[PDB]
Amino acid sequence: TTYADFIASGRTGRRNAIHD
């Protein structure tokens, strides 16, 4: 499922904004 793929990704925690 798309949700499972998201939960298995490295980007489910608080996301850093790129400054540059």
Added chain:
Amino acid sequence: QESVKEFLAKAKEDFLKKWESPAQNTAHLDQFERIRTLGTGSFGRVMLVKHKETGNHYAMKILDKQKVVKLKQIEHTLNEKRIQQAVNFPFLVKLEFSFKDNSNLYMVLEYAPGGEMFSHLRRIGRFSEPHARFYAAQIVLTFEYLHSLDLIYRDLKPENLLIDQQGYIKVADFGFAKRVKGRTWTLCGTPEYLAPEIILSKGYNKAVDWWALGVLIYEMAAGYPPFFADQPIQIYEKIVSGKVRFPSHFSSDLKDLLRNLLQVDLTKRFGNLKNGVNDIKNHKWFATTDWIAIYQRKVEAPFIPKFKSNFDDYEEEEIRVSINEKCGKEFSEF
């Protein structure tokens, strides 16, 4: 239309006077006592503090001046403080005091006791459309306010939305906010939330906030963002592709609104057309929204927090203050 014009004209007068004459050095660290560390940011920590004399509680954002210069974020930090001290709207965290010492910048902010929308969203998975709509409506009104002041917010995401005691939203962190007429160029924000014209080095304007609203509503209602991947560069590829897949439980109204917010073509993106924000407010997904009732906080909230702590715990560390002033020149107007 007739009264909304006069509301915004008075709001702009209030904003411009503080924008042109910013408050500076309105407190000192010794007036505050630590309760707990609430979170961490790119340049430091956020702590819950109590004002020793009055007893009021605040969130205190601490920024390490040396980490800001090193990350070349000086002008953004100057933007952040000057703008946030000048705005006033029910769904924006107030900047109550600011000051600096030898090592750090301090922003003493209105405390939101309900914590981070990010935590609540990840814990429960996804919000129902009515609950997502309730939060989205506050963001719509907030962006209408901010854009009328020539401000672009540039960092809309669940991480930057807090829940207050009444269950309403407060937008925190003006770290990328900027006052610009016309176009700007800085590649900044969070990858999942970047509008395509930010990625494409085209220059961009306030329309990027309306795109980010599309990403936010999608993530609240789906439980994951519309473009995700393990690495930012793969996220960027999906964003510029212009292809969004919607979960089968999304209503037709929600899909339609999102196709118009997640619109790669600027001449077609909702919020950026002749009717402005009214294309969003009059969209069928918002048919049940009483916009005045939302502004007045008369609508029942999806959930009310309970003050005593299912908030995240952080290790308590000392606030280090060097004996030598750091970066004085770079931050003189802070």
